[PDB]
Amino acid sequence: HWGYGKHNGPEHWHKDFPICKGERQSPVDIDTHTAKYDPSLKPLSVSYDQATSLRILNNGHAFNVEFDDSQDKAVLKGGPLDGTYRLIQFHFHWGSLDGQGSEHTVDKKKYAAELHLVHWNTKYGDFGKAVQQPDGLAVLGIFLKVGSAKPGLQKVVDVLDSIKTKGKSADFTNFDPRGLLPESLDYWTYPGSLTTPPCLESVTWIVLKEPISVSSEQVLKFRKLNFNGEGEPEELMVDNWRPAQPLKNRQIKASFK
Numbered sequence: 143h144w145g146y147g148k149h150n151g152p153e154h155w156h157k158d159f160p161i162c163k164g165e166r167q168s169p170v171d172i173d174t175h176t177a178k179y180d181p182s183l184k185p186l187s188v189s190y191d192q193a194t195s196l197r198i199l200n201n202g203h204a205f206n207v208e209f210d211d212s213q214d215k216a217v218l219k220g221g222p223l224d225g226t227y228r229l230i231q232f233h234f235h236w237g238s239l240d241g242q243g244s245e246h247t248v249d250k251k252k253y254a255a256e257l258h259l260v261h262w263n264t265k266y267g268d269f270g271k272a273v274q275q276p277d278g279l280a281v282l283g284i285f286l287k288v289g290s291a292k293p294g295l296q297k298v299v300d301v302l303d304s305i306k307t308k309g310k311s312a313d314f315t316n317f318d319p320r321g322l323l324p325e326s327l328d329y330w331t332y333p334g335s336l337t338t339p340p341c342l343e344s345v346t347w348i349v350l351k352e353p354i355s356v357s358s359e360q361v362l363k364f365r366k367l368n369f370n371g372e373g374e375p376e377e378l379m380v381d382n383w384r385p386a387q388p389l390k391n392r393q394i395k396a397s398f399k
């Protein structure tokens with residue numbers, strides 16, 4: 143099956159998932175000099191006050207912190223978006239070293255990790271339906287750099303020992319995703335795809351300009367997770383990022399000058 147190894151990584155995905163070579167794939171390099179300020183973009187609206195987290199799961203390619211998306215409780219709207227998008231889960235991509243890990247890059251710069259807060263368009267009723275639509279998902283992407291600790295991440299870091307291996311889940315209630323946001327909501331936006339198979343081209347990407355800082359100890363604990371199941375040979379869950387894909391016929395817009 144697909145993964146991030148030598149024999150099943152991103153360069154192989156297209157054999158089972160042809161859309162992975164499509165016209166609007168993600169991530170991309172964000173060339174800050176060619177991105178265009180678009181004064182028509184509205185401010186982003188992140189409304190996470192009533193967010194209800196439920197669970198954290200190691201699914202063999204990352205860990206997802208999952209939310210109750212059965213009501214409008216944690217929603218993204220505004221910016222480039224029409225209508226309302228509900229938070230379903232967040233996860234990260236990270237490296238084996240601090241010098242890599244992000245999926246998007248900024249003038250070719252790779253960050254140590256990248257956070258994806260995944261939201262689906264309520265006009266489609268559920269995530270499964272939404273993910274098949276060209277405007278079905280909105281993903282807020284946030285870069286992580288290593289420096290000072292992010293206090294709001296620590297509760298995530300501390301539960302990772304309980305979900306070391308693929309298929310393990312743990313109760314994870316009352317986690318507040320607002321503690322993962324930077325100060326500024328300035329962003330770049332472009333139309334793209336899931337960055338994991340099936341690579342569906344259903345995503346409005348909203349990538350924040352301001353990274354959050356996490357500590358070396360925090361990211362080190364990400365790197366102790368396993369891609370494998372319990373009782374299978376240990377392979378550390380590191381470098382679970384897809385590299386930048388060709389921009390092709392797209393323009394990245396900036397919300398800021």
Ligand SMILES: [Zn+2]
Pocket residue numbers: 233234235258337
């Ligand atoms: Zn992701």
